[PDB]
Design an enzyme around this catalytic site. Structure first.
Site, PDB file in Angstrom:
ATOM      1  CG  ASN A 205      -2.356  -0.119   0.913  1.00 24.95           C
ATOM      2  OD1 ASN A 205      -3.222   0.470   1.561  1.00 24.95           O
ATOM      3  ND2 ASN A 205      -2.643  -0.933  -0.087  1.00 24.95           N
TER       4      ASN A 205
ATOM      5  CG  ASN B 283      -5.861   3.353   1.094  1.00 23.23           C
ATOM      6  OD1 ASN B 283      -6.725   4.049   0.559  1.00 23.23           O
ATOM      7  ND2 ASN B 283      -5.275   2.336   0.473  1.00 23.23           N
TER       8      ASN B 283
ATOM      9  CG  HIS C 122     -10.442   2.267  -3.644  1.00 13.76           C
ATOM     10  ND1 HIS C 122     -11.130   3.148  -2.837  1.00 13.76           N
ATOM     11  CD2 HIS C 122     -10.124   1.210  -2.859  1.00 13.76           C
ATOM     12  CE1 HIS C 122     -11.225   2.647  -1.618  1.00 13.76           C
ATOM     13  NE2 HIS C 122     -10.623   1.470  -1.606  1.00 13.76           N
TER      14      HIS C 122
END
Lengths: 271, 271
Positions: A41, A100, A250
């Site tokens: 991530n 996130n 996203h």
């Protein structure tokens, strides 16, 4: 495997985490999805932020290389306990938090239960409000391993599908089938999934009490968490700024990397 | 009077303008309101931007110290003609444009008629879409001189009313009664005022054709132009970013000065 970092006992769970930089602490909380981890991530975020801050990015329990306790009860409160446990273990008394999606929901929940431990917050395509389940979200949480299923998830996340290569799908598929990964992930958000979006959310009343300077980020074309959710957060949180990236899906930290990093660093620099 | 700058013939009109800095040209277009001028609108913006760009801030015809032609026809197209005339007069072949409210509507219109003359755009609490007339807007366009009426307009613009001092109201009142100022201003947007919001707006179809990288800025609490208008612009313009400042009214360049200046400079720096 660069996804493997350092290890520390936090809230009684052996935790895999990354710790880079010096100075003001910033906790990065990854999103949810098959094979997701702190490194996967934040690999393009840590380098930029660590130049001015101490960046801590842990694999939340049930994800990445952190231990997966037997009969562990995955829940918003237990995940918040893990975050606080990580901060306690590292003697981090107060820190900024970047969350996130799934991690954004946890950031809000942490700021509500441990307000004095959280300074500024960055919420990206964040969970935290009750929004109607999207096909994108149900596809992610309902994932079963296969390169094609992973390719679809990557397509769901990306604005520019040209970024979804066979190699990336293959690599993410492999990450999703590591020992125990799919087992813990699939046990997390079973059908009906609206229950979990709601469980991860915080009430409007509670959110309105947040005193933290907050930066809400969202990709206009996000297919997983609707833009409307962040617009709602923007109306609820008093000291909030909303930044919407057009031509972005996203994972804004990947498709609008430089803009995202600049916004976050400058936002924290104000403190 | 610092509001008085340099003079140049543009589109046949003697124009008062400010020109500071060197390099890439940036045209700043002020909003509408009694006594408004380029200096009054951009005094805190020019210094910051001029450190990296050549900043041109003209008083649009009918406002400030630019000549007020007899029997002049104030209209969106004539104002766009003035902007292009100013650029032509200064040999500015292409430039970035920052438009505040009324000026944002003009920026959009200029980019549509003279696409090759406009690079990046910053639209702040911008006109440009058809939104229902607000009491705030009707109060501004329907202003008649008095310190109390000006105090009300300042209150309407500000999020933090503590910024509206007796001195500021007095100074702005004085600016509004300068020779010919109220006369031209009051002739601009006579009742019914919805007609003028609509006349300044551009169609959804046209706006969707804009190829320019655009940054849309709006104050959450804006009482003059509704946040919904900028949200709409954010959905219509393809290469757009939307930044909403919480705890901020209609003049974001004044109440969120440092944040605004940083966002704008970095946005143009990308080019």
């Amino acid at each position: 495997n660069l996804e493997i970092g350092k290890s520390i006992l936090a809230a009684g769970v052996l935790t895999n985490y990354h710790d880079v930089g010096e100075g003001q602490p910033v906790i990065l909380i990854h999103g949810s999805g098959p094979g997701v981890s702190a490194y996967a991530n934040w690999r393009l975020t840590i380098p930029a932020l660590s130049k001015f801050y101490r960046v801590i990015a842990p694999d939340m329990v049930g994800f990445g290389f952190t231990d997966r306790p037997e009969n562990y009860n995955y829940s918003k409160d237990s995940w918040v306990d893990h975050i606080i446990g990580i901060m306690d273990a590292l003697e981090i008394e107060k820190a900024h938090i970047v969350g996130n999606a799934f991690g954004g929901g946890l950031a809000i929940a942490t700021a509500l239960r441990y307000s004095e431990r959280v300074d500024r917050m960055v919420l990206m395509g964040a969970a935290g409000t009750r929004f109607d389940v999207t096909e994108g979200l149900n596809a992610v949480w309902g994932y079963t391993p296969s390169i094609e299923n992973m390719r679809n998830l990557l397509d769901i996340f990306a604005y520019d599908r040209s970024l979804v290569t066979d190699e990336l799908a293959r690599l993410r598929y492999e990450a999703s089938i590591q020992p125990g990964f799919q087992e813990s992930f699939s046990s997390m958000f079973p059908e009906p999934r609206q229950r979990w979006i709601d469980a991860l959310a915080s009430s409007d009343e509670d959110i309105k009490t947040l005193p933290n300077e907050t930066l809400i980020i969202h990709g206009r074309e996000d297919q997983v968490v609707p833009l409307s959710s962040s617009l709602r957060l923007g109306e609820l949180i008093d000291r909030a700024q909303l930044h919407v990236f057009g031509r972005c899906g996203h994972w804004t930290q990947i498709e609008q990397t430089d803009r995202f990093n600049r916004l976050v660093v400058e936002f924290f620099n104000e403190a």
